[PDB]
Amino acid sequence: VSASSKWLEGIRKWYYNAAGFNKLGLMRDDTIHENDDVKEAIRRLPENLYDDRVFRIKRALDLSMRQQILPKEQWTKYEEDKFYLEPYLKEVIRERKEREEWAKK
Amino acid sequence: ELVDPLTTVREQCEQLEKCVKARERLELCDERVSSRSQTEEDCTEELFDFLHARDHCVAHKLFNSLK
Amino acid sequence: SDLELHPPSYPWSHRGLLSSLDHTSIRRGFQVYKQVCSSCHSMDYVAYRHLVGVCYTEDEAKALAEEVEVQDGPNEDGEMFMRPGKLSDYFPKPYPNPEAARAANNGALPPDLSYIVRARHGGEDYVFSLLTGYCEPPTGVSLREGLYFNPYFPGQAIGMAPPIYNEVLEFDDGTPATMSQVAKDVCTFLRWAAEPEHDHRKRMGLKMLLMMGLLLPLVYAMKRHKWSVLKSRKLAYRPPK
Amino acid sequence: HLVGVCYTEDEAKALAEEVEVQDGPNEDGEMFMRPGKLSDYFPKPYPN
Amino acid sequence: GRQFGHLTRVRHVITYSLSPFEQRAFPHYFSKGIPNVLRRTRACILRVAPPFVVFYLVYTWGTQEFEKSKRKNPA
Amino acid sequence: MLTRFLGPRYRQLARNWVPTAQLWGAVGAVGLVWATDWRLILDWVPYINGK
Amino acid sequence: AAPTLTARLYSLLFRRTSTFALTIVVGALFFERAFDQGADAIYEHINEGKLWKHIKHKYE
Amino acid sequence: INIRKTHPLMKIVNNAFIDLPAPSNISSWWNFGSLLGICLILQILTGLFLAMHYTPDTTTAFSSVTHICRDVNYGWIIRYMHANGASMFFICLFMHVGRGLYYGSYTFLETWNIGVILLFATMATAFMGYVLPWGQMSFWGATVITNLLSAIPYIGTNLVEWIWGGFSVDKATLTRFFAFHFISPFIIAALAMVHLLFLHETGSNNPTGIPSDTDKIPFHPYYTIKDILGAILLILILMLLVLFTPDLLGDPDNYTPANPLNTPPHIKPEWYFLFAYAILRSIPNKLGGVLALILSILVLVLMPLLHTSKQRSMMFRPISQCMFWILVADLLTLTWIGGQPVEHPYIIIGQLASIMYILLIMVMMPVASIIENNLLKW
Amino acid sequence: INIRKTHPLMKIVNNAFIDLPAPSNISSWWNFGSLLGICLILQILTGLFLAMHYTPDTTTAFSSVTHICRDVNYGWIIRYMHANGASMFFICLFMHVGRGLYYGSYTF
Amino acid sequence: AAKNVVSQFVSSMSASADVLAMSKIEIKLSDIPEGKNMAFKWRGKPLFVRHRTKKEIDQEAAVEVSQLRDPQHDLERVKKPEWVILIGVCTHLGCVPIANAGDFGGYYCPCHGSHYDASGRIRKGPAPLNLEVPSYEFTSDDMVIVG
Numbered sequence A: 001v002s003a004s005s006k007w008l009e010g011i012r013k014w015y016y017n018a019a020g021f022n023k024l025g026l027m028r029d030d031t032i033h034e035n036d037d038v039k040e041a042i043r044r045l046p047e048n049l050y051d052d053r054v055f056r057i058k059r060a061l062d063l064s065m066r067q068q069i070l071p072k073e074q075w076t077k078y079e080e081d082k083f084y085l086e087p088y089l090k091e092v093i094r095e096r097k098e099r100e101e102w103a104k105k
Numbered sequence B: 001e002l003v004d005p006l007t008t009v010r011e012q013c014e015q016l017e018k019c020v021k022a023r024e025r026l027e028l029c030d031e032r033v034s035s036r037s038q039t040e041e042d043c044t045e046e047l048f049d050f051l052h053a054r055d056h057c058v059a060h061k062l063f064n065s066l067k
Numbered sequence C: 001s002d003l004e005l006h007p008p009s010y011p012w013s014h015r016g017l018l019s020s021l022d023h024t025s026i027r028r029g030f031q032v033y034k035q036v037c038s039s040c041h042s043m044d045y046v047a048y049r050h051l052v053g054v055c056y057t058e059d060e061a062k063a064l065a066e067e068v069e070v071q072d073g074p075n076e077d078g079e080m081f082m083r084p085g086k087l088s089d090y091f092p093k094p095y096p097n098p099e100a101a102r103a104a105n106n107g108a109l110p111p112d113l114s115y116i117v118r119a120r121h122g123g124e125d126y127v128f129s130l131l132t133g134y135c136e137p138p139t140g141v142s143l144r145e146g147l148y149f150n151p152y153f154p155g156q157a158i159g160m161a162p163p164i165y166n167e168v169l170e171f172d173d174g175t176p177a178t179m180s181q182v183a184k185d186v187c188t189f190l191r192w193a194a195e196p197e198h199d200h201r202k203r204m205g206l207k208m209l210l211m212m213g214l215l216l217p218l219v220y221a222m223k224r225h226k227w228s229v230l231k232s233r234k235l236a237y238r239p240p241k
Numbered sequence D: 001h002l003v004g005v006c007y008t009e010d011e012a013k014a015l016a017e018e019v020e021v022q023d024g025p026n027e028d029g030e031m032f033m034r035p036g037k038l039s040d041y042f043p044k045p046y047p048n
Numbered sequence E: 001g002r003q004f005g006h007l008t009r010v011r012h013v014i015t016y017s018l019s020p021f022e023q024r025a026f027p028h029y030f031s032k033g034i035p036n037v038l039r040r041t042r043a044c045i046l047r048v049a050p051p052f053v054v055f056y057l058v059y060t061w062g063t064q065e066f067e068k069s070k071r072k073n074p075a
Numbered sequence F: 001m002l003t004r005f006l007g008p009r010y011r012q013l014a015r016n017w018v019p020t021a022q023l024w025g026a027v028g029a030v031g032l033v034w035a036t037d038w039r040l041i042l043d044w045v046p047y048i049n050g051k
Numbered sequence G: 001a002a003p004t005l006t007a008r009l010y011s012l013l014f015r016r017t018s019t020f021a022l023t024i025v026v027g028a029l030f031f032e033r034a035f036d037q038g039a040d041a042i043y044e045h046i047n048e049g050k051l052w053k054h055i056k057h058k059y060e
Numbered sequence H: 001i002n003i004r005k006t007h008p009l010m011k012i013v014n015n016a017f018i019d020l021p022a023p024s025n026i027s028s029w030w031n032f033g034s035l036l037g038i039c040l041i042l043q044i045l046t047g048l049f050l051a052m053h054y055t056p057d058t059t060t061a062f063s064s065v066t067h068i069c070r071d072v073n074y075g076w077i078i079r080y081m082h083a084n085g086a087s088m089f090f091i092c093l094f095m096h097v098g099r100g101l102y103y104g105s106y107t108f109l110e111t112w113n114i115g116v117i118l119l120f121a122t123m124a125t126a127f128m129g130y131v132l133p134w135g136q137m138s139f140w141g142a143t144v145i146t147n148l149l150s151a152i153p154y155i156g157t158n159l160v161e162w163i164w165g166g167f168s169v170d171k172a173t174l175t176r177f178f179a180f181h182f183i184s185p186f187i188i189a190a191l192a193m194v195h196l197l198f199l200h201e202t203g204s205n206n207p208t209g210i211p212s213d214t215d216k217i218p219f220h221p222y223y224t225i226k227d228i229l230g231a232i233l234l235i236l237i238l239m240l241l242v243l244f245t246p247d248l249l250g251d252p253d254n255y256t257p258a259n260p261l262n263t264p265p266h267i268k269p270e271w272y273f274l275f276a277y278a279i280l281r282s283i284p285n286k287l288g289g290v291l292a293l294i295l296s297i298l299v300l301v302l303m304p305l306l307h308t309s310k311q312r313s314m315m316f317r318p319i320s321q322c323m324f325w326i327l328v329a330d331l332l333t334l335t336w337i338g339g340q341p342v343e344h345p346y347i348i349i350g351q352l353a354s355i356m357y358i359l360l361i362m363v364m365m366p367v368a369s370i371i372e373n374n375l376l377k378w
Numbered sequence I: 001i002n003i004r005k006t007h008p009l010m011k012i013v014n015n016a017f018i019d020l021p022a023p024s025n026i027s028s029w030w031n032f033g034s035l036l037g038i039c040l041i042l043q044i045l046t047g048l049f050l051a052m053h054y055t056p057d058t059t060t061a062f063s064s065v066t067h068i069c070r071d072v073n074y075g076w077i078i079r080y081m082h083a084n085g086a087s088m089f090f091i092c093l094f095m096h097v098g099r100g101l102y103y104g105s106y107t108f
Numbered sequence J: 001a002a003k004n005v006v007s008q009f010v011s012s013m014s015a016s017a018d019v020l021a022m023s024k025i026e027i028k029l030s031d032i033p034e035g036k037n038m039a040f041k042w043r044g045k046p047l048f049v050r051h052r053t054k055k056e057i058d059q060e061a062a063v064e065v066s067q068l069r070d071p072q073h074d075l076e077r078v079k080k081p082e083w084v085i086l087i088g089v090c091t092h093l094g095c096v097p098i099a100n101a102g103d104f105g106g107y108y109c110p111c112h113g114s115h116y117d118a119s120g121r122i123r124k125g126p127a128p129l130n131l132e133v134p135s136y137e138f139t140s141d142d143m144v145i146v147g
Ligand code: HEM
Pocket: C032, C036, C037, C038, C039, C040, C041, C105, C108, C109, C110, C111, C116, C120, C121, C126, C127, C131, C158, C159, C160, C183, C186
């Protein structure tokens, strides 16, 4: 979430200071629109992770209703964000690429 | 000679400055085309304009006047 | 004449968000009917039984009708000869045939005024600005003379004298006479044909102003009253270890 | 209606035209007479 | 489908509640409204405006364009 | 993403459905005919000639 | 007081559900005619443009 | 047990409004919906009561209208009023469309296409329904859309006959559409409960955009009371424009009696029907105009098909939002465009506005989507 | 899976007409029901189409009636006809009442 | 069964014995002497029938197409040189043109000064588009069917 990505992923950082996500402290991965692949993707998610994304999500709802945001300090640390799913997810990308693959076969 | 901002203030009101300017451009064109022969233009634009001011102040007075 | 006078705003006595009028000009509007206006005019949807409560009294309205020839229905009689007319009798406008208009002036459909304000376009000034704006053609133009000179108008040329200026002289209660209370009584008895509750309904709007101001807060309160707890909630993420 | 029924295009035709329409007005309200059309109906008696 | 109880899985979390009559309807009401209010609004403004700008520029603009275009000239 | 159903497999699938496809298509067409009896086609219809 | 308004007028009023309601309509009267009246006053001070006419109409 | 749980019709009910679990994060995007139905109900309600007096007869048109207006006390109010209220329904209509849009709610197809049925349905259902007044505006304009009935190759002549009832618009139409109105509202209704159950199936989205199972409450109290609120807001709206300046939105050509020979200068659609007729006159060909027309909403269907981004909420997608309010600019833009009669600047103006509609949606919005994706990098 | 099983609107449908398990012993007492609805539908249907022409206006009463009858081809038929059909609906109506009665179906 | 049923229902919207009749009901005699502009009442509007003169035809043929307010070459309206059939309502604000009047050997609108040439064609006044031409076929020599 840093200057190129604070301009660009600073649509998610400076301009999600504007578009909100990361300054809202969101989870990058969490932003993926729910899809089936996304669905079972999460089904396979890691546990401690699952809790984490949970608290994140709920909180997001919380301030959302509150229509407030955390301290800009509390606003999320830029860059410095594990790509949570992306190993798991992207793995699934290969999966549905595989079901998709022999499927093509 | 009933009180007639129509007539009455049309003296008083239409003495207006801007009104007079439109009168300048006005009779100006009046003679302008007037000189011409075999021409289609009646130059209504001015008459319209002067009227527009005449009203502009007019109801801004006449009603307040009129009873 | 294709160049629209944006009719100036005559501070119409009703021109306020709520504001009122006088009538018997409309009687002289009826006498504009009887003379000026509805000689050539229809209000035709106009119905006398309406104005009953408006201006004249039970008798004054009564005779006001009876003062007119009904041209009654037939008694065995088809044909249908004349009567005095009732309150139930409407406001019996002019010459019947559409060609009676076409001839009346040359062509010149003399339309009904019933909605005319609310019908044609523009406001009281359409009477004041436009109609009272009967005026000489400036130049460069000649009608068939069928159109008189009314410069303020669609063609700037037709149709009308100021029977004020050349007085058919009536103020029954007495005054010098002007166009409004029969013009805006042709707007009123157009609105008194449309928005007489422009008074009555006006009244209700008042209470509305309060109801919301009361309820709207009370409502919003109630909403907060509900949602409040949810507002402040504390939910703990305390993952074990 | 009866057009197709009995008389012929002409026979119906005149059959109408044989009757006085009492036409609508031409400028004319009043409304003087015509021969009437097939479109003209079957013009029954005294009005009142 | 939904309703509850088949709903979803939540492990190791916690809550806190309060009865309604407890609170005050409008703590810091005017106060809190605030550049909090301007925080949402003002936050969005830049994102918002430009099109509307073009608008006023337009109805104004073309308003002039055709409006003047209705004027008559000499010769 | 036509590649999804684009493959000699689904290609073969089409190769199967093809004649049937002709069949149901004909069904629709003729339906338009008899239903409509639209003059445009109706003309060519002999002894289905109605006059 | 106001504590018996909030309270007793809960208790001796808003407590019993019915009582709360009977209270409600009980108002519906007073409010109704009242706002009717003062409202009429508003319109009254608004104009005096007609129906005061009778005296001027010389109220035969 | 709890009858709330127990009673079968109720079992629907609780399942419908009452017991309904719903996303807690829920946003004001809501209100309009119940409004519309309330509107709709009132619509019917008034129309009904309106119907109760009103006659829709050829000689009676302005005639009964007076009887329904000049006679009719509060037929004044109810009439002109809830007439305006129709337009209000349109207001929340286009609004609501926006709701899905910046929502991007397009995720749920049967809902989307549903409200598409709601779309063209609302459109003509009005139009016919609307025209019923048969007023000079709606009259020569009746010659207008009446001339819309003729479009097709080889058909329209016979069609705009069959539509028109024959050689022109007529009392034929009068009955025809008159009924057509009488019917269509019902259609809207059943359509409604339809799309509704469809909704209850999936549940539905959230302004947040996250899976809602995290947080839900029943509409009662929350969405319930909130709804009550927005309703009061409505009566403010309707009961306002009504209550204060009823005629404000009107076009005088209405009160103008239909004068068959008239054909006056204006010929415009309603603030409701507005943005169309511009779009109509925009192109120089028949089916261009129409296919465009149905291609605006239909276009929106494609937009669900055109859905691109890896994230639902444009909230996180600012450049998208630029395309959003920007697209709106193209929209009310299209309004004021129609807001002029045929004019030199306008020609080009709308001429480009269409491209926008095709770009700002079909291209520039989708192109935008792709772009934002590229930027996303996650 | 089976869309018949699967499709939600269908899920109603199969649950309604199609997948509907129903007493095998079932008796002719039935028929009238769908009839009525068919009737009803036709009722509406015709009425609708009827409405389509018909005007219900004061001067038009017999007038439009002629236009709806004397004019109306099959307005003859549709009109007078499905008019009778109404009565038929009544027929199965009273009938049907009987159905419950000798049925004694009053249980529900 | 369904075919007739459905096609009866659909027919009931298409036209009417009543509306039909009157729709195309129009014929003309050959009494219109070159010169006079008769006038018929067809479809609730004015149906003008003008028998014309070599002089007429000749001049009307020689108007310039390029400069007309509503460009439309005489020769494409009338199906027969000699005869011109029109609808009698002024395309401005709807009065009725006056037969052979006004500055152009056509008609005259006594409402705003609207001049029509012999064809229909607008040659003076606000009038927008030229008087409109009905559909009609000439039957035998003495017969003309408007509509
Ligand atoms: C106070 C009485 C009258 C009032 C308030 C009145 C007002 C009006 C108004 C508002 C219009 C329509 C303006 C428009 O189309 O925008 C009109 C049209 C007309 N009235 Fe009057 N008028 C009155 C008396 C007359 C009289 C005495 C005559 C007979 C000279 C007359 C003959 C006409 C005609 C011919 C028109 C049609 C104008 C045209 O379209 O060329 N009216 N009038």
